[PDB]
Amino acid sequence: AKSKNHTAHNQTRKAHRNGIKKPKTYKYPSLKGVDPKFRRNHKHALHGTAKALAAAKK
């Protein structure tokens, strides 16, 4: 009893009825996979500038 093996028939019609979506970009992307040495220093850089505005704007 042989049957069909594979077909991509109807697979693009199915993928388009819900309108293929772009990945919804954001400002401030995740720092996942960024170099740890840069990321470790960026933590200290953001802390200092947060204090700089805190000391001035208050």
Binding string, residues 12-51; x marks residues near RNA by CB under 7 A: xxxxxxxxxxx-xxxxx---xx-xxxx-xxx-xxxxxx--
Are 20 and 11 in contact by the 8 Å Cβ rule? The answer is no
Task: Collapse the DSSP code of 2 into the 3-class scheme (helix H, G, I; strand E, B; otherwise coil) and give the result.
Answer: coil
C-beta closer to Mg ion: residue 6 or 24: 6
Supply the minimum distance, in Å, between the C-beta of residue 38 and another protein: 8
Instruction: Of 25, 32, 58, 28, give the one whose Cα is nearest residue 46.
Output: 28
| Residues that bind another protein in the complex, under the rule CB under 8 A | 14-16, 18, 20-23, 29, 33-35, 38
